[PDB]
């Protein structure tokens, strides 16, 4: 946890639908945007901490 990686993703066009269609995910949470309305918005410097 103290040594997380920051992967910056840009210039990408991916289906932001399977990101919640994955049944392996125990529980999916969103705090800033509506989960269904993920495709419409335009992003900037997406981060991929894990």
């Amino acid at each position: 946890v103290y040594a997380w990686n920051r992967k910056r993703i840009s210039n990408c066009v991916a289906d932001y639908s399977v990101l919640y269609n994955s049944a392996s995910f125990s529980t999916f949470k969103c705090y800033g945007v509506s989960p269904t309305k993920l495709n419409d918005l335009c992003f900037t410097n997406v981060y991929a901490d894990s």
Binding site: Y20, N21, A23, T27, P35, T36
Partner: protein, 45 residues
């Protein structure tokens, strides 16, 4: 109707969820009292 465990996480007014969003959602203006209790004793597919 019955669900396998992860129920309250999906059954709620204005609550998403694959089973909830594909089978039956509640109205945003809803007035009811849902109850839940295990029926595993009642292996059985």
């Amino acid at each position: 109707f019955v669900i396998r465990g992860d129920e309250v996480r999906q059954i709620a007014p204005g609550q998403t969820g694959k089973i909830a969003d594909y089978n039956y959602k509640l109205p945003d203006d809803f007035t009811g009292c849902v109850i839940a209790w295990n029926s595993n004793n009642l292996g059985n597919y």
